[PDB]
Amino acid sequence: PQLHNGLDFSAKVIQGSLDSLPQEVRKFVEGNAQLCQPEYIHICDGSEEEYGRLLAHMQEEGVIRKLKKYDNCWLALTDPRDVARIESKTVIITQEQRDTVPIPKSGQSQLGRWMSEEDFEKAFNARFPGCMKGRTMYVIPFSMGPLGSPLAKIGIELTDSPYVVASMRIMTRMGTSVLEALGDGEFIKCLHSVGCPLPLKKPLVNNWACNPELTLIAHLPDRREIISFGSGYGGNSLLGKKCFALRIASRLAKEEGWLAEHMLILGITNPEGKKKYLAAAFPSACGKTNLAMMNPTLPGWKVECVGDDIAWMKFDAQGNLRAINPENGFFGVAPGTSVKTNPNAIKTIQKNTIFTNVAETSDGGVYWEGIDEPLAPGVTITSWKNKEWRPQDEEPCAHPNSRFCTPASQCPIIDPAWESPEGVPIEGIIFGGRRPAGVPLVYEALSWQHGVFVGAAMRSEATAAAEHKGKVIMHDPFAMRPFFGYNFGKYLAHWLSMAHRPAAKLPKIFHVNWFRKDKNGKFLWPGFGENSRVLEWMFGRIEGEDSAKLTPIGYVPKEDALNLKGLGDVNVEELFGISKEFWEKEVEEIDKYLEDQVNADLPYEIERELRALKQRISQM
Numbered sequence: 001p002q003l004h005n006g007l008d009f010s011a012k013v014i015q016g017s018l019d020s021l022p023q024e025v026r027k028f029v030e031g032n033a034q035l036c037q038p039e040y041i042h043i044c045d046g047s048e049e050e051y052g053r054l055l056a057h058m059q060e061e062g063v064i065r066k067l068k069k070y071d072n073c074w075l076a077l078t079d080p081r082d083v084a085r086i087e088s089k090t091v092i093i094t095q096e097q098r099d100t101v102p103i104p105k106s107g108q109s110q111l112g113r114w115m116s117e118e119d120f121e122k123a124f125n126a127r128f129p130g131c132m133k134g135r136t137m138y139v140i141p142f143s144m145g146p147l148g149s150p151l152a153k154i155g156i157e158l159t160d161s162p163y164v165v166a167s168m169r170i171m172t173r174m175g176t177s178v179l180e181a182l183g184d185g186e187f188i189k190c191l192h193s194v195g196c197p198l199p200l201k202k203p204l205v206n207n208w209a210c211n212p213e214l215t216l217i218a219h220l221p222d223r224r225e226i227i228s229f230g231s232g233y234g235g236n237s238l239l240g241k242k243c244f245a246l247r248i249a250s251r252l253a254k255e256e257g258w259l260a261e262h263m264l265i266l267g268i269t270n271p272e273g274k275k276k277y278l279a280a281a282f283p284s285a286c287g288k289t290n291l292a293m294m295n296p297t298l299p300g301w302k303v304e305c306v307g308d309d310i311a312w313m314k315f316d317a318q319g320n321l322r323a324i325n326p327e328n329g330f331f332g333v334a335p336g337t338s339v340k341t342n343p344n345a346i347k348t349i350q351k352n353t354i355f356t357n358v359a360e361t362s363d364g365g366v367y368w369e370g371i372d373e374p375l376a377p378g379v380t381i382t383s384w385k386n387k388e389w390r391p392q393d394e395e396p397c398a399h400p401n402s403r404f405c406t407p408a409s410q411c412p413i414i415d416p417a418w419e420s421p422e423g424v425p426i427e428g429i430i431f432g433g434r435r436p437a438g439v440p441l442v443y444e445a446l447s448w449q450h451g452v453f454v455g456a457a458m459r460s461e462a463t464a465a466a467e468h469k470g471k472v473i474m475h476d477p478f479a480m481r482p483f484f485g486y487n488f489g490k491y492l493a494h495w496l497s498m499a500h501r502p503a504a505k506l507p508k509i510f511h512v513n514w515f516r517k518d519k520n521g522k523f524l525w526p527g528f529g530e531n532s533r534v535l536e537w538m539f540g541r542i543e544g545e546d547s548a549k550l551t552p553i554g555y556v557p558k559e560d561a562l563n564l565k566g567l568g569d570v571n572v573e574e575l576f577g578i579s580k581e582f583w584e585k586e587v588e589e590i591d592k593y594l595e596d597q598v599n600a601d602l603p604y605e606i607e608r609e610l611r612a613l614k615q616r617i618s619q620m
C-alpha cells in the first residue's frame with residue numbers, strides 16, 4: 001500500500017516484473033531502490049540476448065572494447081586506483097568482536113577487521129543514500145553451486161555496474177531459473193554500488209566509475225547480507241566469490257558442519273587407470289590456477305580441473321570428504337600465463353572471455369608480461385593505461401593483477417564431475433606458499449592434528465593481490481587470512497573436530513614449496529607441468545607406498561622415490577635440505593604469531609603440535 005506514488009517502482013522496471021518476484025526478493029529490491037534511487041531497474045534473466053545487449057551497451061559507453069582477433073572476447077580498463085581486493089577496507093560486522101576475530105594478546109589482529117553495527121550504520125548512511133541516481137539497478141539472481149546441489153546457496157546481487165552483471169554471468173549460475181529454484185527460500189542479500197551517482201562531479205579515468213576514498217566491503221553474517229561500495233573490481237564487486245563463497249560461507253559452514261576454503265580441486269589419473277581428487281590451498285598469486293589446469297610432463301598421467309579457487313566440502317554418510325566447486329568460471333591472473341606455463345588456460349580464454357587491465361595489440365589481441373609469444377611485424381601494443389607502449393618503458397603493459405574471466409565449461413580439461421551435485425571425494429589436501437628459503441619442495445604431515453598445524457603455520461612472501469609491498473614473509477594460515485568469516489581459533493577447532501567424526505576418512509595432508517631459491521636468486525625447481533612429479537609421489541603415498549622418510553618436520557620422499565628423470569641437474573640436496581638454524585627461527589616466529597594472534601582461542605592440540613615440533617628440532 002501507499003498514500004502517494006513514491007514506493008512502487010514498477011514504472012521504472014525496464015526488464016522483468018516486480019510482481020513475479022518472491023515477496024522477500026521484491027522487498028529487498030524495492031527497499032534498496034527507495035534508498036539508492038536508481039533511474040531504472042533491470043531484473044536479469046541470464047539470457048544470451050540480454051548479455052549481447054549489456055556488451056553492446058558497455059561498448060557504446062566506452063566501458064569495454066571488442067578484441068577482434070578472438071571470438072566474443074572483450075577488454076575492460078579500470079581506474080588505476082581500482083585494481084585489486086582492498087583487504088584494509090573489508091570488514092565483518094558482529095555484535096561481539098570475538099565472533100569475528102580472536103582477541104589478540106597485545107598486537108592488532110591480522111585475522112580480520114571487525115566493525116561494530118553502530119559504526120557500520122554511520123558508514124552506510126554516508127555512502128548509499130542516492131548513490132545510484134541516474135543509473136540502472138541490475139538485479140542478479142545467482143546460484144553458487146549446481147542449481148539443485150545440496151550444498152548450493154542462492155544470492156541476489158543488486159548493482160549499478162553492467163561490468164559486474166556480465167562477469168557474474170560467467171562466474172556464477174545466473175538468471176531466471178535461479179528465481180524459480182529459490183521460491184520463498186532464504187537467500188544471501190548482496191548490495192553493490194560503484195558510488196558514482198549522476199550527474200558526475202568527478203570525471204572518470206578510463207570510463208571506469210569507482211569511489212576509492214569511500215570504498216568499503218562489509219559483511220553482516222547474522223543478517224546474511226553483503227554490502228559493497230566504491231570498487232568495481234574483482235573480489236570487491238563480484239560478491240558471490242570471495243564475500244559470499246568464502247567469508248559468509250565459512251561462517252555458515254561452521255554453523256552447519258561443512259567447510260568453505262580457498263582451494264583448487266583437481267582430479268589426477270595415473271597410468272594404471274586409477275583416479276584421485278586433491279584439494280590445494282595456496283595464497284593469492286601462488287599458483288592454484290596453474291596447478292588446477294596443469295599439463296603434466298609425465299607420460300600416462302592426466303589432470304582434470306574441478307575448480308581453481310573455492311571449494312565447499314563436507315563429509316557424506318560414508319565418511320568421504322566431498323568437495324564441490326561453487327563457481328561457474330575462472331577469474332585468473334593473466335600475466336605469466338603462456339603456452340609454456342598454462343597451455344590449458346590459453347585454449348580456454350580465446351572465446352567468450354572478458355579481460356580486465358591487460359594490453360591490447362593493434363590487431364585485436366591481448367598482451368601481458370610473460371606471455372612468451374612474439375608479435376608480428378607492424379603490430380603495436382596499447383598498455384592497460386590506454387597508452388602506446390614499447391618494451392623500452394620501465395612499466396609493464398598489463399597490470400600485475402590483471403585478470404581473465406572465462407567460462408569453466410570451455411576448459412578442455414574440465415573434469416566430468418565438476419557439476420555433479422554430490423561432489424568429488426577428496427583424498428589429499430595440499431598446503432603451500434612462496435618460501436624462497438628453508439622450506440623443502442614437499443613434505444607430508446604426521447597426523448591430522450599435525451596437518452592442521454601445518455595449515456595454521458603457512459607463511460608466504462608478499463604478492464600483488466591485496467595491497468602489500470616489500471620483501472616480507474607474512475602469515476597466511478590455510479591461505480585464508482583475507483577470507484575468514486569468523487574467529488580463526490574456532491576455525492582451527494572446527495578443522496580439528498573432523499578427526500572426531502565416526503568413519504571419517506581423513507585425507508592425507510601435504511605441504512609444498514615451488515618457490516625455493518638458491519644463493520643465486522634463481523629457482524631450484526622448474527615447476528608448472530613438472531609439478532606432476534610431486535603429485536605422483538603424493539598419489540603413491542595416498543595408496544600406501546613405502547616411499548617416505550621421517551624428518552623433524554614430517555615425511556619427505558626417499559632418495560630416488562621422486563621421478564627426476566629428464567630434469568638433469570636438479571640440486572636435490574638444496575631442494576630437501578632442512579637446516580636446524582632456519583627451523584629454530586621458524587618455530588619461534590610461528591610461536592609468537594599464534595600466541596599473539598590467536599591467544600585464548602588457540603586449541604590445545606595446536607599448541608601441542610607447536611611444542612612437539614620445537615622438541616624435534618631441538619634434538620637435531
Ligand SMILES: Nc1nc2c(ncn2[C@@H]2O[C@H](COP(=O)(O)OP(=O)(O)OP(=O)(O)O)[C@@H](O)[C@H]2O)c(=O)[nH]1
Pocket residue numbers: 282283284285286287288289290291308309331332333335336337341465514515523526527528531
Ligand atoms: N615459479 C613458479 N611460479 C608459478 C608456479 N605456478 C604458478 N606460478 C606463478 O604464480 C602466479 C600466480 O598463479 P595463479 O595460479 O594465477 O594463482 P592463484 O593461486 O590461482 O591466485 P588467485 O586466483 O588470486 O586465488 C603466476 O603468474 C605464475 O607465474 C610454479 O609452479 N612455479
Ligand SMILES: O=C(O)C(=O)CS(=O)(=O)O
Pocket residue numbers: 084085233234235236241242283284285309331465
Ligand atoms: O585474491 C584472490 O585470491 C582472487 O582469486 C582474486 S579476487 O577474486 O579476490 O579479486
Ligand SMILES: [Mn+2]
Pocket residue numbers: 060061
Ligand atoms: Mn551514454
Ligand SMILES: [Mn+2]
Pocket residue numbers: 262284309
Ligand atoms: Mn583466490
Ligand SMILES: [Mn+2]
Pocket residue numbers: 288289308309331332333
Ligand atoms: Mn587463480
